[PDB]
Amino acid sequence: SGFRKMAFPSGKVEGCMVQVTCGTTTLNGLWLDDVVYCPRHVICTSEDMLNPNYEDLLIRKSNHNFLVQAGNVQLRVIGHSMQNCVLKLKVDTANPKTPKYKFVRIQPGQTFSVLACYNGSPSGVYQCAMRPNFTIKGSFLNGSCGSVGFNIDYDCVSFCYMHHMELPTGVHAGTDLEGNFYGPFVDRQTAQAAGTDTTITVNVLAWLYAAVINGDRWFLNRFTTTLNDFNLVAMKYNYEPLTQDHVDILGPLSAQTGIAVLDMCASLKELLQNGMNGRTILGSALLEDEFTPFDVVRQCSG
Amino acid sequence: SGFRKMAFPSGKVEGCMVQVTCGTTTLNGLWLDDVVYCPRHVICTSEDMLNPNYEDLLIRKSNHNFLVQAGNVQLRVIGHSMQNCVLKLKVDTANPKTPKYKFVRIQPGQTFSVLACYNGSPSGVYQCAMRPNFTIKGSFLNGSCGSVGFNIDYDCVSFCYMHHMELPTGVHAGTDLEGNFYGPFVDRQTAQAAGTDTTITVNVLAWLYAAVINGDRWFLNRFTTTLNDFNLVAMKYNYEPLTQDHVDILGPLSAQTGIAVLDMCASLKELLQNGMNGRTILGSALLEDEFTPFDVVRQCSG
Numbered sequence: 001s002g003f004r005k006m007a008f009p010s011g012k013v014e015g016c017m018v019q020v021t022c023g024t025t026t027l028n029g030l031w032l033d034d035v036v037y038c039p040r041h042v043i044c045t046s047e048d049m050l051n052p053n054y055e056d057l058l059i060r061k062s063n064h065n066f067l068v069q070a071g072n073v074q075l076r077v078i079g080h081s082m083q084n085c086v087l088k089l090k091v092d093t094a095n096p097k098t099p100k101y102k103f104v105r106i107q108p109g110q111t112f113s114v115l116a117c118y119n120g121s122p123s124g125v126y127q128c129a130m131r132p133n134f135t136i137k138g139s140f141l142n143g144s145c146g147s148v149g150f151n152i153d154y155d156c157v158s159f160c161y162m163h164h165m166e167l168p169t170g171v172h173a174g175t176d177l178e179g180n181f182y183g184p185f186v187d188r189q190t191a192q193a194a195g196t197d198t199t200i201t202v203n204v205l206a207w208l209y210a211a212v213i214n215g216d217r218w219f220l221n222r223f224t225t226t227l228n229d230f231n232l233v234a235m236k237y238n239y240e241p242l243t244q245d246h247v248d249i250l251g252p253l254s255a256q257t258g259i260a261v262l263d264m265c266a267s268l269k270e271l272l273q274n275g276m277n278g279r280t281i282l283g284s285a286l287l288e289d290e291f292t293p294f295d296v297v298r299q300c301s302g
Numbered sequence: 303s304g305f306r307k308m309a310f311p312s313g314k315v316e317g318c319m320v321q322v323t324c325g326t327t328t329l330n331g332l333w334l335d336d337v338v339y340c341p342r343h344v345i346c347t348s349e350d351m352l353n354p355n356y357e358d359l360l361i362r363k364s365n366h367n368f369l370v371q372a373g374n375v376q377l378r379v380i381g382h383s384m385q386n387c388v389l390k391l392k393v394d395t396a397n398p399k400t401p402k403y404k405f406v407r408i409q410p411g412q413t414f415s416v417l418a419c420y421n422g423s424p425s426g427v428y429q430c431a432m433r434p435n436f437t438i439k440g441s442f443l444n445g446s447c448g449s450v451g452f453n454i455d456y457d458c459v460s461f462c463y464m465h466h467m468e469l470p471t472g473v474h475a476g477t478d479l480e481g482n483f484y485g486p487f488v489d490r491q492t493a494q495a496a497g498t499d500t501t502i503t504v505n506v507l508a509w510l511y512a513a514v515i516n517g518d519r520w521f522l523n524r525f526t527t528t529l530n531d532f533n534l535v536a537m538k539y540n541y542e543p544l545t546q547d548h549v550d551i552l553g554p555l556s557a558q559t560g561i562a563v564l565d566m567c568a569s570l571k572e573l574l575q576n577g578m579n580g581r582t583i584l585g586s587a588l589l590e591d592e593f594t595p596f597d598v599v600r601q602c603s604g
């Protein structure tokens with residue numbers, strides 16, 4: 001019993017974290033086989049923030065301009081290239097700790113674990129979700145760029161995020177591991193800001209099922225709703241539309257609790273319209289939307 | 303920016319997790335140097351739950367009754383002994399992955415990271431706090447006993463918890479790594495239950511400072527209070543008393559924000575008396591008490 005914001009064990013990723021220095025700029029890199037991945041912003045200088053031309057900046061560098069440190073061991077850089085917003089530094093040594101891995105791009109509403117790192121040294125691990133507006137509500141300080149987000153399935157690490165920058169509302173933006181940004185952001189200094197965000201409905205419903213599995217039942221009711229009527233209410237409260245695929249994905253949790261998805265939707269409608277009247281659900285006083293149906297099934301009793 | 307419930311990176315502990323089997327009972331163990339630590343309940347059988355005499359149960363076992371598996375490698379048990387509620391299995395091989403480590407017992411109100419494990423395999427990592435009533439609000443399923451809680455300082459893992467059981471309210475009880483329970487619980491089947499709990503005041507204040515460091519300021523006010531008047535209100539709301547040592551420990555955060563501790567106390571008093579009127583703090587709609595002053599300083603900008 002119990003329900004926590006749980007991350008994947010971070011050991012497989014810890015063994016891949018390195019420090020990358022170019023000029024007076026230091027940040028984190030990810031060492032897999034004989035390649036180190038890092039943000040290309042590492043080749044900028046203090047004056048280059050406004051309109052860097054990265055192709056120009058990179059053609060003026062050579063391998064010896066990149067210092068890579070894995071713990072207390074300097075890795076010799078033997079090639080360098082750029083792919084979208086990331087840099088690929090070929091080193092003369094394959095990381096002996098490389099896990100089985102994949103580079104996957106995730107969808108808004110999906111969750112992942114972040115290993116926050118400074119100077120190539122892991123500092124903490126936490127769970128995040130990709131918001132509908134393609135930002136993440138991370139916890140990052142200066143020097144954390146290059147930190148990665150991931151999921152682990154069996155023995156395989158699916159890397160899905162590399163951290164780049166912080167937007168003016170304190171939320172975070174980054175790329176997949178092919179260097180393509182999530183959302184309409186760029187690695188340069190502009191007035192860019194997070195766009196409007198919405199709540200991830202299917203996740204809220206998953207979390208209500210978690211609560212029922214864990215014995216919070218006070219928000220249940222004898223009502224049902226149609227998907228259309230539910231989605232009318234959802235729209236009114238800035239919630240994403242619920243699709244039939246979402247209903248299908250909630251099938252297992254529905255079956256385990258014996259609560260039809262559209263019955264749980266009726267509960268959510270009442271909670272949106274009435275609040276919780278001073279009660280809590282799984283120790284929260286607001287509706288939590290950063291657990292996927294998969295997260296609930298993995299953590300909760302069967 | 304940002305503030306998350308952050309755990310320590312778990313890799314150093316992952317390399318210590320093993321599976322311990324006795325009869326038809328399997329659970330997790332912790333392998334450090336040439337010793338494996340696990341709950342002594344592993345030597346119980348289905349009939350022994352009510353009033354086990356562990357001394358008797360153990361004298362009837364020998365080394366070959368204990369199967370220890372580290373990944374795909376069977377560790378040969380060469381001695382066995384009991385220390386309070388844990389078992390110590392001497393194995394013929396020192397764990398090559400043993401980190402620098404300590405066995406520390408923690409105080410109510412202190413936090414630690416939990417590596418939830420099943421069958422000796424790590425499954426997730428999350429942050430917890432020891433409640434004033436010596437329970438923890440964990441996330442544990444059947445088979446998780448033997449999972450450990452820890453903090454990491456520099457390179458040194460301070461183990462502080464081994465998981466044993468779940469109480470009837472769904473909260474969890476366990477021991478330190480010398481096998482002594484936290485709180486008035488025992489490793490046998492009784493009507494034992496969590497006693498009354500209280501909110502950890504100094505932690506709530508630490509978290510309000512986190513929020514100010516992160517730009518939530520709406521709950522601040524121009525008032526101050528005395529420690530005595532504050533503690534009168536605290537008592538009324540089931541909050542722990544605030545001591546001068548607590549005020550001193552909050553000194554750094556006070557200095558960084560320029561908000562005197564007793565001014566922040568005045569804010570907390572108003573929040574207890576009035577609620578938040580539909581606002582949130584660091585994405586919560588209730589007052590969070592599972593971050594210590596140290597946790598805030600470590601995670602937050604300086």
Ligand SMILES: *[C@H](S)C(=O)c1ccc(Br)cc1
Pocket residue numbers: 027039040041042143144145146163164165186187188189
């Ligand atoms: C450092 S966290 C980094 O990579 C970076 C990327 C993009 C911008 Br804009 C600033 C800093």
Ligand SMILES: *[C@H](S)C(=O)c1ccc(Br)cc1
Pocket residue numbers: 329341342343344445446447448465466467488489490491
């Ligand atoms: C398994 S999680 C275990 O160690 C245990 C300890 C004490 C009691 Br009572 C039940 C199970």
